[PDB]
Amino acid sequence: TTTVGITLKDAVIMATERRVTMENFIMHKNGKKLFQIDTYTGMTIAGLVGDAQVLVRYMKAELELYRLQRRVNMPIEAVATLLSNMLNQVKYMPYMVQLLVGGIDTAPHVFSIDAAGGSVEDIYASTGSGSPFVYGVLESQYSEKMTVDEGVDLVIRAISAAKQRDSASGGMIDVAVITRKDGYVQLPTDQIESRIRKLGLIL
Amino acid sequence: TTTVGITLKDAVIMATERRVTMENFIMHKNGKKLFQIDTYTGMTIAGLVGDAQVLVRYMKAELELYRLQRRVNMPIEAVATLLSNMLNQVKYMPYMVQLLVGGIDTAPHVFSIDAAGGSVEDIYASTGSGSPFVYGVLESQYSEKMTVDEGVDLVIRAISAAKQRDSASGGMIDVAVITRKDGYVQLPTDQIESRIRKLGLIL
Amino acid sequence: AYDRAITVFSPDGRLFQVEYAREAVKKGSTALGMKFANGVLLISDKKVRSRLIEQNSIEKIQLIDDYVAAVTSGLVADARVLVDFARISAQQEKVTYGSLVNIENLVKRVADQMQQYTQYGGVRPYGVSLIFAGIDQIGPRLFDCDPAGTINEYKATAIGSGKDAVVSFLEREYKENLPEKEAVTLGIKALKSSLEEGEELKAPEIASITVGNKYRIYDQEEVKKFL
Amino acid sequence: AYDRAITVFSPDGRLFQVEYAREAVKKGSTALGMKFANGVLLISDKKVRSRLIEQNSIEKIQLIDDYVAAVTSGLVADARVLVDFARISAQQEKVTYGSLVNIENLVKRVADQMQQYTQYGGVRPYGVSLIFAGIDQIGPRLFDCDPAGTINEYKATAIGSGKDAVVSFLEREYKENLPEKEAVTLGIKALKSSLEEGEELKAPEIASITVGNKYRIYDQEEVKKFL
Amino acid sequence: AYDRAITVFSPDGRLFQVEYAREAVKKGSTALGMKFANGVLLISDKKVRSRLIEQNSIEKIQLIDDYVAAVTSGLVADARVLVDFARISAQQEKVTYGSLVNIENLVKRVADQMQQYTQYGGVRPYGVSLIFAGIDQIGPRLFDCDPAGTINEYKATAIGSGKDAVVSFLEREYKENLPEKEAVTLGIKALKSSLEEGEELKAPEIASITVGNKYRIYDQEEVKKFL
Amino acid sequence: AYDRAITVFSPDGRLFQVEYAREAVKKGSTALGMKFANGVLLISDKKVRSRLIEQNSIEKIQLIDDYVAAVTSGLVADARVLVDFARISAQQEKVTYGSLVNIENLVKRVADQMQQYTQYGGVRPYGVSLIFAGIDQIGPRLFDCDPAGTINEYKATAIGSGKDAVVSFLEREYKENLPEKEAVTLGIKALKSSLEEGEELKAPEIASITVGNKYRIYDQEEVKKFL
Amino acid sequence: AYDRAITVFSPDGRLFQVEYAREAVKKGSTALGMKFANGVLLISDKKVRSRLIEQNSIEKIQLIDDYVAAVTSGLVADARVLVDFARISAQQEKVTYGSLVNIENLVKRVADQMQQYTQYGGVRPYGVSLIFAGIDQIGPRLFDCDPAGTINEYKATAIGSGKDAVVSFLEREYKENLPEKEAVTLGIKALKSSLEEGEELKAPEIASITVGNKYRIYDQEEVKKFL
Amino acid sequence: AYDRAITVFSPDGRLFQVEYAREAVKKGSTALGMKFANGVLLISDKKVRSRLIEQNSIEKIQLIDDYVAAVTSGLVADARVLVDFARISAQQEKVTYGSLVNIENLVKRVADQMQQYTQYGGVRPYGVSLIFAGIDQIGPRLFDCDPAGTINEYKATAIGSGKDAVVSFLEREYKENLPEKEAVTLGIKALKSSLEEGEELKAPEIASITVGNKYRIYDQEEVKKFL
Amino acid sequence: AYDRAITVFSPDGRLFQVEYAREAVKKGSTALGMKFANGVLLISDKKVRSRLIEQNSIEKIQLIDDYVAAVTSGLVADARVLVDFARISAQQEKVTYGSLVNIENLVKRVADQMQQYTQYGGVRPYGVSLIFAGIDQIGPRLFDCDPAGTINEYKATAIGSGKDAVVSFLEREYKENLPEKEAVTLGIKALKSSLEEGEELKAPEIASITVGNKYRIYDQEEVKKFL
């Protein structure tokens, strides 16, 4: 269940993988892990299936409500704070989840929220069984300057090395990009493969 | 999660560090640990992320309410007492937190409140995984007389040695200073680095 | 001497209170909508007021969801209130099923709510009437929810002091599947013919949706066209 | 001075309120049904209205379950509401027993519900009357639930402004076990003879069921036959 | 000006409301029953109605249990309702003690229920009167529960517009321990003499039970005998 | 215009409703009791009725416990009800303390109950009056509980349309410690002198208890003696 | 037209209902008490009644606790009731603090209770007035609690149809610290002078307490002394 | 016909009930207070009464806390009650914050309480008016809480049948920062000039507080000075 | 005869009660506000009163938050109350989202609250009208919440006995984006022209905010300028 979310200049990328495990067993080689939760916001579930999904819905619904009646997206921080609160209000009967809230309001943000409700903003954040790897690559390949496309590559180079050690992550590599201009925009499968083949990976 | 709060003549300093851990893992090398909870009051979270933050908010909100309708800040003691009570009212379903309430009302105060709700005022107080060190430096370097600036240095010299043994603390070193005259005032990053470089530390 | 409580039937077997609220609705400015070739539309009269009023907050038309929206007519207080329930109910519906599948149970939730208030003492029904319209797994949708909880799906209908006159028209002029722009004007005419001699139909708001597309509110200039 | 609260008996020992709602029902358009050789049927008058109204949502006949269905007569608001309870109750019944065994306790649930509202202040009874019909472990079924919770199983009965005249007929013309089509017309005649001189019985909806088969709604053309 | 609420005593100290319901019961068709040599019986008048009504659902006599049964008189709505409570209460009684030991606490449960509704505002008492009869650890049983919760054990009694005239008779003709068939007719006579000149006592339903035996409903032909 | 609610004081400071119920009690047939040498007794008038009524269920005297018993006077409905509470309360008292120690708190429980209903709207007090009598750790006991919750311990008192006349007597003839049989007749005389000219005191029921002994109901022949 | 509900102020700003209950109290027989040299006393008039009434249960004076006691005046029903609360409250107070420390919060509990009932609809205040007296950590105590919850500590006061006349006296004759026996008679005189010409002050009950001693009720012979 | 419920506005938009209670307050004896140089004071008229009344319990002035105190005017019942809430609220405030920081939220708690009772049916507002005064983190404090929950901070104000006349004075004579003794008399004069010709201002109670000091009640002799 | 309950519609379909409270608001002193170039302002008339009243507690303008503030008009009691809810609601909003994002849902919370009270019996609506203004993620904000829960966002509006006349002005003189000081006076003029001949607009309070800045209250001297 490897996912990540990096910031940049007027942009935010969020890429996951899509495998659902159960020990030395693989139920689905293709599930969903990256969703658009609002016009300029995304989210990456990671951990317990059920909980995660229920959250996404509990979310997508609430962001939309606000947006529909207030005519303005909700600040990326208030979104993480909302999620924060929800998770802590029942920290003793938690959600075996771990999500990432990324998007752009006035600036490109990225939040990592835990089963406790503690949400902390950072430059990049990798949630998932194979994140220690993504955190390995990134601590030796990420740079604030990077181009909108250099980013989409970096993210991939990570989840692609992660998929090389984390028995729990696999499948395709869904990626998306939030630009103040184009808003949330998921990349086409083919386009992702293009990136792959060039680097030198297989799957 | 190393933090501290020292008193002085008509002034109070509160300095933290900003690292969020998870064992031999470091999620964020830069989070928030020092917040202004009122015109002449500050607070240092330390321990469990979620809980801590929720508290800060539960707080900032309440101090503000009072202030807005009563037109006068709330006594630094009443602030610690309030927190005290809130923490004990559910001491069996506690907050994996440990906070410090520092500020100036009529005099410079500093309170250490635990998961039980017991708040005790002291000269200085170091909350956090690297506080035993801060308590080491201070028990051989703090003096009631000290200047407004000698303080800002002492605090740093501590969290800077703490960062040398406590695998859990790191990052920058956020510092602030409450003066009856200038009220809560956080120092600029650059200014902090100035202090560092002169002493002889790195990071 | 019966028209005093929401729970007392008259000797004829009428609930005068409930009726009286269908009367409060009749004091609200006209508004209709009709489905056509892939989608529906909504038109609402609005007798322009104080230029000190931010036009954003005087639109009898509201976007409940991206694919659904409604319009009210009656007590303004009850207006807003109900609107929210719709928006809110929408969500719950949307979250327990993954998507607002049938626009119907959105209108059910609202109808059931409004109905209740017309059966218990200590309460008073909503003096509002709502017309819902949008796109669901089925397609173009149009319902009209009255104060008593009564809901009916139309191809074209209206609410407000006009209704009768506006339906009198459509009920003898409306012809389904019209290409948006054509259906737009027909309703414009229908709406027009509900005013009183001398009155000049000012700029009325209009919005539409079409199979596979989100709603859209005609801006005052794209509207100033059918004038 | 008694006919004001649902809980006050008159000096004769009458509950004028409850009656007044049996009066609201009498303002609804006629509708009957009768069982025959393996199954039952239902007929409902409907004075065709605005062609702007999606016919799907104006059928006094409703499919509670595949093997059971009902028809109402009275306040439209209360109409929908009750209908649901039926549908809903149906299910619960269906899930605790694995199948809607006796169509009876479906009608019980509804009767008990409607009854309550005629004994407590702060509430008002439903101004509706429901005729249930279908197939259960026993066979053809027909019940008629009035506002006060009163239920009776028939072989043929009706509700609405007609009822009396429609039962006056059947009560001296109906002969059991007729082959669907025959029973269909008899009721058609019965229904006819309830109108007022000059009126022309327009196209009324009709549905049936027969031991081992699901219901079926005669389409407007298969109906246009018995005209 | 007192006869308006179930909770207001008059200057004489009367509860006119409660009375008025004993009045609603007086509008229901007569019905009596009496114990005899090992068992009791019940007789109920029924002025035959629409042949479209399934006779199964028009029997003022009901089998609460195999060894106990009752009959009502008054508001039909409240009739059914109470009946159930009896049936229901029966069970609970039957399950906490392993068997319906004393038919009495079955009648208690019902009396206590009916009583309540004659002491709180916001409610209205049942306009029904129930006569229970059956066999328990003790033997033949006969009780008559009125709207106010009042219960009394008889050897013979009745309810309905007749009651008085039917009791006037028994109260000067009834002689205990009669052999079923004999007691049956005596009551038939008694019942007869309650009608009004001209009226012809049609076919009334009758049921009985006898120490060690379950009840039994005389079929319309075994009844057509005592005519 | 005050005598309408149980919670409104008159300008004199009276609670006419509560009084009116002390009026309902006054419509019940007389009944007294008095303690004597080791024990107390109770006498109740009963104007013999229908021989169709099982005498077991028409005794104004009831055995709450083996060592205690009471008698009522007023609304028959409320009569039964209260009686039970006594019996019931008796038990709880008996189980939390191992035995019905003071017959007093049995009467308290009942008084407190009856009292309540004379202070809250939405309710109506009991139109009953109870006379308790028995043996406790202390000895012979006699209390009389009125509709308003008022309790007083006597040596001799009565309730019913007679009371006054029966107390008028005892209040100038009663002499304590009489040997059962003697006290029995004295009361019989007292009771007699409360009737109206012409009336013949029929057979009244009587029961007694004596330090160390359970109660006992004089049978109609042992009673036919003091006639 | 205001004096109808416990919650409606008059145009002058009066609560006529609450007053009316201070009126019910004024219908109860006089009773005063006064502290003196180490302790207080209480005197209550009692117009001797039926010798059939066990004197134990007709003492307007009650021992709440060994060191405290009170007296009432008004509706007898409400009388008993309040008395208990005092007794009851006493205990709770006694158990949470190990001893009835301040007799005050005993009177508070009672005042607060009585007060409530004079602010909510659906209820009616107590038509009683209580005079408390005893010994606490402080010493002699005397309070008088009225229907509205009003409490005041005295050195001497009274309640009942007399009050005024009895206070008129004390208010110009009472002199503190009198030696029990002397204070006793003074009150006796005061009490006397409240009757009406012709009336002969019969035997009134009296009780006292003195720093370090439990209460004591003067027996009818030790009382027959001050006659 | 509007002045009957606490929840009904008049056609002018008035709440006559709430007003009427501001009228009950106007029936209470005058009382003012004013802050000065470091601290505030309070003065209350008291028309000396029965010498049988322990002066300790007739002081319209009460010490809520050592540093805060208040005075009431209106229904004595509601008087005590509110007083407690103040005292009680004081504490909670004092315990959640370690000290009664702002005397304001003490008055808020009381205002909010009193306000409520002026918006729900089934209740009636307090016929009391309270003047709070004391020392907090800020300094001298003076607030006046009316029946409707209205609170305002003064430098000098009053309540009671006088108020107007007492404020009429201060509103044209009061000059801040006066040295206690001087402010004391000014108010004494102000107070004086509110009586009616002939009346002689008897001994009124007075209390004060001054930055860093606890309150203090001038004893009847230190008061007899400004006479 | 309809204008008596908050829950009864008139024959026209009006809720006279709710209206009557919009009438209570009309008795409060005028107050307007308008946004301009980056920010909004608020002006409130105040007919200077007793110099004994601490000016701090007589400002119809209140700082809900640093970036938001409001003004009321109507019943002073309900005034304070609502104000708090705003302040309070503010916080909750501020804590669940980390900051008061949209000033709108602050006004929603308040509108929804106020609305409720105009639909249930047993309650009465707030006789207040609030004008909110401040800065949020969007920018300058101005809403006006009436007694019935109705909210509308303006560029300029007012409440109070003036409103109409003040809006009459702005509605034909107001021109957006004015530089604070200019918008300040325009409103001053507008406000002026609402008084009655002879009256001299005294010193009215004024406050403003501007994108990126906290509010600020013009002090009586910076205000004395636009006089």
Swiss-Prot record, chains A, B:
Question: How does its activity get regulated?
Answer: The formation of the proteasomal ATPase PAN-20S proteasome complex, via the docking of the C-termini of PAN into the intersubunit pockets in the alpha-rings, triggers opening of the gate for substrate entry. Interconversion between the open-gate and close-gate conformations leads to a dynamic regulation of the 20S proteasome proteolysis activity.
Its protein name is: Proteasome subunit beta
Task: Spell out the catalytic residues.
Answer: T1
Q: What is the effect of changing T1S?
A: No effect on catalytic activity
* Assigned keywords, A-Z: Autocatalytic cleavage, Cytoplasm, Hydrolase, Protease, Proteasome, Threonine protease, Zymogen
The miscellaneous remark of the record is: The configuration of the closed gate contains an opening large enough to allow rapid entry of tetrapeptides but able to impede the entry of proteins and longer peptides.
Record keyword Cytoplasm present: yes
Q: Which domain of life is it from?
A: Archaea
Physiological role: Component of the proteasome core, a large protease complex with broad specificity involved in protein degradation. The T.acidophilum proteasome is able to cleave oligopeptides after Tyr, Leu, Phe, and to a lesser extent after Glu and Arg. Thus, displays chymotrypsin-like activity and low level of caspase-like and trypsin-like activities.
Q: Which residues form a coiled coil?
A: none
* Catalyzed reactions: Cleavage of peptide bonds with very broad specificity
| BP GO annotations | proteasomal protein catabolic process
Q: Name one GO cellular component term.
A: proteasome core complex, beta-subunit complex
Q: What class of enzyme is it?
A: hydrolase
Q: Which compartments is it annotated to reside in?
A: Cytoplasm
A Pfam family? Proteasome
Q: Does the keyword Electron transport apply?
A: no
**What is annotated about its quaternary structure and interactions?**
The 20S proteasome core is composed of 14 alpha and 14 beta subunits that assemble into four stacked heptameric rings, resulting in a barrel-shaped structure. The two inner rings, each composed of seven catalytic beta subunits, are sandwiched by two outer rings, each composed of seven alpha subunits. The catalytic chamber with the active sites is on the inside of the barrel. Has a gated structure, the ends of the cylinder being occluded by the N-termini of the alpha-subunits. Is capped at one or both ends by the proteasome regulatory ATPase, PAN.
In its UniProt record, a GO molecular function of this protein is: endopeptidase activity
Q: Which HAMAP family match?
A: Proteasome_B_A
Family membership noted in the UniProt record: Belongs to the peptidase T1B family.
Report the EC code(s) recorded for this entry: 3.4.25.1
From Swiss-Prot, chains C, D, E, F, G, H, I:
Its chief place of residence is: cytoplasm
Post-translation changes: The N-terminus is blocked.
PROSITE patterns given in the database record: PROTEASOME_ALPHA_1 (PS00388), PROTEASOME_ALPHA_2 (PS51475)
**Annotated Gene Ontology cellular component terms:** cytoplasm; proteasome core complex, alpha-subunit complex
- Top-rank taxon of the source lineage equals Archaea
Biological process annotations from GO? proteasomal protein catabolic process; ubiquitin-dependent protein catabolic process
- Keywords for this protein: Cytoplasm, Proteasome
**Entries under InterPro entries matching the protein:** Ntn_hydrolases_N, Proteasome_alpha, Proteasome_alpha-type, Proteasome_asu_arc, Proteasome_asu_N, Proteasome_sua/b
- Entries under SUPFAM superfamilies matching the protein: N-terminal nucleophile aminohydrolases (Ntn hydrolases)
Could you tell me where this protein is found in the cell?
A: Cytoplasm
Entries under CDD domains matching the protein: proteasome_alpha_archeal
One Pfam family per UniProt: Proteasome
Q: What GO molecular function annotations does the UniProt record carry, in alphabetical order?
A: endopeptidase activity; threonine-type endopeptidase activity
Q: Share any extra remarks.
A: The configuration of the closed gate contains an opening large enough to allow rapid entry of tetrapeptides but able to impede the entry of proteins and longer peptides.
Record's function text = Component of the proteasome core, a large protease complex with broad specificity involved in protein degradation. The T.acidophilum proteasome is able to cleave oligopeptides after Tyr, Leu, Phe, and to a lesser extent after Glu and Arg. Thus, displays chymotrypsin-like activity and low level of caspase-like and trypsin-like activities.
Record note on quaternary structure: The 20S proteasome core is composed of 14 alpha and 14 beta subunits that assemble into four stacked heptameric rings, resulting in a barrel-shaped structure. The two inner rings, each composed of seven catalytic beta subunits, are sandwiched by two outer rings, each composed of seven alpha subunits. The catalytic chamber with the active sites is on the inside of the barrel. Has a gated structure, the ends of the cylinder being occluded by the N-termini of the alpha-subunits. Is capped at one or both ends by the proteasome regulatory ATPase, PAN.
What HAMAP family does UniProt report for this protein, alphabetically?
Answer: Proteasome_A_A
Family per similarity comment: Belongs to the peptidase T1A family.
| Record-given protein name | Proteasome subunit alpha
Q: Which organism is it from?
A: Thermoplasma acidophilum (strain ATCC 25905 / DSM 1728 / JCM 9062 / NBRC 15155 / AMRC-C165)
- Give me the gene this protein comes from: psmA
